[PDB]
Design a binder for these strands. Structure first.
Ligand SMILES: Nc1ncnc2c1ncn2[C@@H]1O[C@H](COP(=O)(O)OP(=O)(O)O)[C@@H](O)[C@H]1O
Lengths: 96, 96, 444, 109, 80, 85, 97, 109, 96
DNA sequence: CCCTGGAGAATCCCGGTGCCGAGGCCGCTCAATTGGTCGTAGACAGCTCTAGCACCGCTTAAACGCACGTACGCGCTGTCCCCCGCGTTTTAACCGCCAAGGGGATTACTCCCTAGTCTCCAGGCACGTGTCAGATATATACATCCTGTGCA
DNA sequence: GCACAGGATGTATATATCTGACACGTGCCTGGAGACTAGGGAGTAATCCCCTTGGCGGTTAAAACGCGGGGGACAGCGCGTACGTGCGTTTAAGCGGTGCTAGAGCTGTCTACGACCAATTGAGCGGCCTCGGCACCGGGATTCTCCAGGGC
């Protein structure tokens, strides 16, 4: 039976998602996460839907940029697999 | 009808018709352009205010706007923006 | 009614009449308790008179206490040799060397207090003011006192902070630019007399005020030689490129910050500015001469003197002009020896000896106007050509007298190059003003 | 009587509102006084920058075979121009996506 | 509510990494990225709630979110 | 007609000096190609700062660059400096 | 036969010494020449206050020190002890310059 | 009659100039009106921050065995403390030096 | 007689003698402290002005100052500074 | 150890739907027009202190060139386990719809809080001036690092 | 093969000196406090209706889980290379000077033009409807790629 090698499907997904322009996180789980986090600062808070949408946009952009920098660090280590040490190095160099 | 809100949308549309006569724009894109115009305005005006405070003046002038655009825009954009502003002020002075 | 002959404590030598007169004047200064400035020209045994003063103050007065002499470094060995030759009864020590030698010296000779005179340099005084400040100084002697002619300078402040009883300044040019310098010297001498900052109201009053504190013996008492000099001003006009650059400088990419300093060199040679010379070929052929008025006149002048007596000294204030002149002399194939600040001292002395060798083929000796050490005995030369004039006429006089020394035989002609309708006219007029001030005040 | 009112934008030959820019400057607490040439200069600069971005975005949309500018086109225009990318480096554009880019080590050998 | 960081699922993290341009992902990346997301969200939500409180509102607005992002240096065009 | 240049001014930032900077940075071994890279990095940074400082000096209609102008340029860059006003 | 320290002891001593002090590690006159040369291309006939050059040197040295810290971190990431132009370029790329 | 002048700093118990802060606010073009309690609040906050930094710097000076504070002590105090490090993260202190820090790999073993 | 320059040196010295009676401060450390006070003042005042513009108000008040403090200061500093300022405003309002 | 040959994915072209973008109308509030005034900035003059240019003289610390040896960067190899690609089953997200009421948003009213003004006075700044804290030097005491050698 | 003695190096330490910057005291003047008035911003109450939140049911894409295998991470080894260490030589930095300007800052005035405030009015701009061309969705035929097997 047909079977793609380990890495061609990943490249296809890379091209597809770099072509697309839509959000990649489920909106109801993200909304629940936002409300949970907001419970720590005030009670009975209400949100505009636009507020949750903007939060998701910012979070996705931050994560995508972080993953780009992490990929660069992994390539620097002469690897193709990214690691928590790469994420930590990217954050440390950024200033976080 | 609630309170009226001000946006640069019609002026953006006029510029767009000048540049590409038969090309349109969507609502999200116009919102992005409005946000861009507001951000650029605030950057330039704040820089000019700082310049006036530094030189111990009380009026924001065309010289302050020119210095602010030199400070904030990079390179060729700064040159072309300076040229456009100088042309506009020349026409305004001569044609008023 | 004072010492009328050569003193006895000074052995191997009879002091001349002017020497003994100066010694008597210094003794009168000590007796009256007034500090004085001794400026008896450039060759009338000033060092010998100072040594005789210290010898007297130790022998006929019983104060062999600490004495300090401040000298330029180049004169330290001369001072020590003179001390050992003329008056060896005194005990003189010299402080030089790096930090380890200075520490060893202070631990060995200075602090134990077995010496009587100390001969140090300006730099060593600045370094060891901490240890020299402790002692009580009976007599302080400062040679070439025009070093401290300027107040607000560290050396003047430091020499003021010492604890002294008597003070003596040796110089030849007390007045160089303005009366503030003379007041600065006199204020170091007698701070309680000249505490203030500043022909019945002038000239004569100034003479009467200065006479109790000063003594100048022109080099005319001896004479009997040294035929008088003669100064000729040669006026030159700008070349065409020089005119173009003069207009470019006045009207206003090269930075032109000190406009006066750019106009000057422009009056010397347009080649100094970057790119004024022709392109990459970079050849030395007749476009150096023709692009400078001083250079065309100099090329018309040098061969005539050469077929005549030759042995010409050329002075300038720019090492760049020295480079250009060296290239010209290489192209025309004369003989040149160069001396400026970048020349090491051994090479300097070798060049002086080689030019002064009794029968040599050398023709042009080029010097920076301030790069000498008041020595330099170029007495075999005949003609002095001043490419550039200095704001300080004493600098020009010293440049002249480097070739007007006692060994001179024939009269010397001094050629001063001036551009007409430039800033050189201003420079020369200011120099004339300063020289007239100096002559009227000090010379008379 | 009074002459027909000519807008300052018409006097300056611009398409952005000089009077509105002047009011925004006056109400913004930037300085005590505002000169007459400052609003004209600022409006001209805004017009130039807007024209630049719109031109690049329209070119990108045409290369995508569309006629309406969308945030993807705006993001492509901004990120494919060095000066505008230097200006908008800290800006996130909603629904703009990212530039296609894969590091050469990751491509199959 | 509780247990909502686990709603950010592994496939979503894979999609975000693929848009970032990565090919191979280690198994421990997911907890790390959940931590990063939580700290980022906490900072932004704290600032937005401060703005909302100052306005004496009980609703958080997209304007508050935009203002918080701009003060943190993360300007967001597309909402006002 | 005598030309003799001295050296490039970017070479005045010397290899031992760059080594001292790396020591304060905490570096143990340094490659030989680091020095040219560091010279380029320093040149770029200085160019940005000096361009902004000159813009301020021109606005003030002066020809002298002041420490305050440098401080304002650094604050524009985002590199606040304390200790000069 | 003469006593010699191993390759790395003196480097650590220098690290501790220069992390203990606060002086400037670059020569003032060469730095001043560099600054004047750079400003020449922006505007001729420029004069500098001496305090401006000191502030410039302070900022430049701080920038270089921070860059070298990040470079060292990247070199340790690559399982190395020697810093390289690759490490400098990676640090700059991540920082966004 | 008239009463003796009492400074607003004395009234509030602050060692910082309430009146000078009020004047600086009014001349800084931040808003067209400034409240009464705003300068008091701002001066108190500035005082708290200054007191924190000076306390830490004095502790660092005691560790260094000197009775005067220098920029080195200020830098050591600002670093080594996370709150002030976040506050002054992008700030350079002139001749302040750097923290002693050697990575674990670089040590001999 | 030269011009008048204003600085916070007097008050910095007062706080220094209040928190460490036997300790001194050098001129350069005073310069740094003065610059620090200026920078913090400007950050807080700018954030308060932006808040007033956002809420369409014209008065900078203690509420705006408190909100700016909470926005700018990280955590423990924020809450302690809030307590300090509340103490000060209470003392000023109570009997002054 | 690359060439056909299958398969999977993606692309292009062609036709049917829907949804808002772009136009046309209405009403209002905000900018443009005149007129008058005042205060800010431009222009000038007179002092003082710093910065640029071209030199000199001297001291000395640091850069520089060179040579040797040694950690180390780098390539190569083998092993193992871990992440990837695929298929099955479950789960909860999405979407549409409905319902209720909490809070955002606007308006009217009034009061109280701040800006502006004029006196009055004391707190803060420039200016002098002394003394002591720290820098530096010197001579020890000690802690570290490295090697050679004696012992299994 | 490992561990220790010892030598040499560097470093921490106590003491003594000296100097230049910190800290204090003084006069005075400029900005802050006291007391008042006047007016507009904002606090307060009340109404509306929009937008949020909660709930429910049906679909279906997406998540979770388990399998099987090849590729990538990682440890180890060998080598030769480039960097660290130290030494003798050279250079240029650093300090202290000349000599002349111009530049820039604080002081003090004068003065005129440009920005501000106010009162009218009418045109530009924002909100509201309405409609059709573009964007989207599906469907079918097509091209490109990726993997595997072997006669090249
Ligand atoms: N034996 C001597 N005694 C006194 N003066 C002499 C003697 N020999 C030479 N001189 C003079 O010394 C001058 C040069 O020496 P110089 O350094 O000026 O000495 P000083 O500084 O003592 O005058 C010459 O002009 C010469 O006249």
């Amino acid at each position: 039976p047909h079977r793609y090698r380990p890495g061609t499907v990943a490249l296809r997904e890379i091209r597809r998602y770099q072509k697309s322009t839509e959000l990649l996180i489920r909106k109801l789980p993200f909304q629940r996460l936002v409300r949970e986090i907001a419970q720590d600062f005030k009670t009975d808070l209400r949100f505009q839907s636009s507020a949750v949408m903007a939060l998701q946009e910012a979070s996705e952009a931050y994560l995508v940029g972080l993953f780009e920098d992490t990929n660069l660090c992994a390539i620097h280590a002469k690897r193709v697999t990214i690691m928590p040490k790469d994420i930590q190095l990217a954050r440390r160099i950024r200033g976080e | 009808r609630k309170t009226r809100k001000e946006s640069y949308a019609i002026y953006v549309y006029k510029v767009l018709k000048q540049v590409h006569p038969d090309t349109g724009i969507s609502s999200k894109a116009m919102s992005i352009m409005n946000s861009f115009v507001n951000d650029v305005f605030e950057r330039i005006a704040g820089e000019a205010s700082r310049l006036a405070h530094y030189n111990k003046r009380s009026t924001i002038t065309s010289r302050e706007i020119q210095t602010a655009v030199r400070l904030l825009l990079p390179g060729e954009l700064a040159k072309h923006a300076v040229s456009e502003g100088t042309k506009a002020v020349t026409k305004y002075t001569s044609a008023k | 009614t004072r010492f009328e002959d050569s003193p006895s404590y000074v052995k191997w030598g009879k002091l001349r009449d002017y020497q003994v007169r100066g010694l008597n004047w210094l003794i009168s200064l000590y007796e009256n308790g007034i500090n004085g400035i001794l400026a008896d020209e450039m060759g009338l045994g000033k060092t010998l008179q100072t040594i005789s003063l210290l010898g007297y103050m130790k022998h006929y007065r019983n104060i062999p206490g600490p004495h300090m002499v401040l000298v330029p470094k180049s004169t330290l060995h001369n001072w020590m040799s003179e001390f050992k030759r003329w008056v060896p009864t005194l005990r003189s020590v010299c402080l030089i060397g790096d930090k380890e030698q200075r520490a060893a010296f202070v631990r060995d000779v200075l602090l134990p207090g077995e010496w009587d005179v100390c001969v140090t340099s300006y730099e060593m005084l600045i370094k060891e003011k901490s240890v020299f400040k402790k002692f009580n100084w009976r007599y302080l002697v400062i040679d070439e006192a025009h070093r401290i002619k300027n107040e607000k300078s560290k050396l003047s402040e430091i020499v003021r902070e010492f604890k002294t009883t008597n003070r003596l300044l040796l110089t030849g040019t007390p007045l160089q630019n303005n009366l503030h310098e003379l007041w600065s010297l006199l204020n170091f001498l007698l701070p309680d007399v000249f505490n203030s900052a500043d022909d019945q109201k002038l000239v004569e009053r100034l003479h009467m005020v200065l006479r109790p504190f000063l003594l100048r013996r022109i080099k005319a008492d001896v004479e009997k030689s040294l035929p008088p000099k003669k100064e000729v001003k040669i006026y030159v006009g700008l070349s065409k490129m020089q005119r173009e650059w003069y207009t470019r400088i006045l009207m206003k990419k090269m930075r032109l910050l000190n406009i006066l300093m750019q106009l000057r060199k422009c009056c010397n040679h347009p080649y100094l500015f970057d790119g004024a010379e022709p392109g990459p070929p970079y050849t030395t052929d007749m476009h150096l001469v023709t692009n400078s008025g001083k250079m065309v006149v100099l090329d018309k002048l040098l061969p005539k003197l050469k077929e005549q007596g030759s042995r010409v000294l050329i002075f300038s204030q720019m090492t760049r002009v020295l480079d250009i002149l060296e290239d010209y002399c290489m192209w025309r194939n004369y003989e040149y020896c160069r001396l400026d600040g970048q020349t090491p001292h051994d090479e300097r002395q070798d060049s002086i000896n080689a030019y002064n060798e009794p029968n040599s083929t050398k023709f042009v000796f080029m010097l920076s106007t301030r790069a000498g050490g008041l020595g330099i005995n170029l007495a075999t030369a005949d003609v002095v050509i001043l490419y550039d004039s200095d704001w300080n006429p004493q600098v020009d006089l010293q440049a002249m007298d480097r070739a007007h020394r006692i060994g001179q035989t024939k009269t010397v002609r001094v050629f001063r190059f001036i551009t007409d309708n430039t800033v050189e006219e201003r420079i020369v007029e200011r120099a004339e003003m300063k020289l007239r001030l100096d002559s009227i005040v000090i010379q008379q | 009587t009074r002459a027909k009112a000519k807008t300052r934008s018409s006097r300056a030959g611009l398409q952005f509102p000089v009077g509105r820019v002047h009011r925004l400057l006056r109400k913004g607490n930037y300085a005590e006084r505002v000169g007459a040439g400052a609003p004209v200069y600022l409006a001209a600069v805004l017009e130039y920058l807007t024209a630049e971005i719109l031109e690049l975005a329209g070119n990108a949309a045409r290369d995508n075979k569309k006629t309406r500018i969308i945030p993807r086109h705006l993001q492509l225009a901004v990120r494919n121009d060095e000066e505008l990318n230097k200006l908008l480096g800290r800006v996130t554009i909603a629904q703009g996506g990212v530039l296609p880019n894969i590091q050469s080590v990751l491509l199959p050998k | 509510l509780r247990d909502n960081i686990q709603g950010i699922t592994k496939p979503a993290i894979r999609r975000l990494a693929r848009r970032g341009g990565v090919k191979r992902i280690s198994g421990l990346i997911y907890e790390e990225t959940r931590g990063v997301l939580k700290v980022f969200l906490e900072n932004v939500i704290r600032d937005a709630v401060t703005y909302t409180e100052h306005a004496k509102r009980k609703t958080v607005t997209a304007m508050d979110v935009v203002y918080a992002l701009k003060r943190q240096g993360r300007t967001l065009y597309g909402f006002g």
